[PDB]
Design a protein around this ligand. Structure first.
Ligand SMILES: [Hg+2]
Ligand SMILES: [Hg+2]
Ligand SMILES: [Hg+2]
Length: 139
């Protein structure tokens, strides 16, 4: 019923799908993490997080908008679906964890970057229509 959260972003740039070395996650068990098939995108958030509201979405939380969305493991399934210049709704199912789309593994090339967010395997993306985009902006 309220078992979901989402947020719109404009997809600005999509990095190649390729194996990358990942950072040693700061404060976790030290290991040499193997290269992993991965990509990431540069997005710009178009509005704040929206709670699931029955069959729809609630008002965006009041709103720097740059984000790097990081895909590995089964989230690689999104690669060919995602095109620069389009707007997508990023959806996380389940209980509304308050600061979910603020921040959280990380590619070594993005060590110490200010706004990385890992796409979880149960997260989904939907392509937004022109009217979808306007409705969020207008609220
Ligand atoms: Hg690039
Ligand atoms: Hg509600
Ligand atoms: Hg980043």
């Amino acid at each position: 019923p309220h078992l979901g959260q989402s947020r719109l972003f404009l997809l600005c740039h999509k990095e190649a799908l390729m194996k990358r070395n990942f950072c040693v996650p700061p404060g976790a068990s030290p290991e040499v993490p193997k290269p992993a098939l991965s990509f990431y995108v540069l997005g710009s958030w178009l509005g704040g997080t929206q709670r699931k509201e029955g069959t729809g979405w609630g008002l965006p939380e009041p709103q720097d908008q740059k984000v790097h969305l990081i895909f590995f493991g089964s989230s690689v399934r999104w690669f060919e679906f995602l095109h620069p210049g389009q707007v997508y709704r990023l959806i996380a199912p389940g209980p509304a964890t308050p600061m979910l789309f603020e921040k959280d593994r990380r590619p070594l090339e993005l060590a110490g970057c200010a706004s990385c967010l890992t796409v979880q395997d149960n997260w989904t993306l939907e392509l937004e229509s022109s009217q979808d985009i306007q409705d969020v902006l207008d609220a």
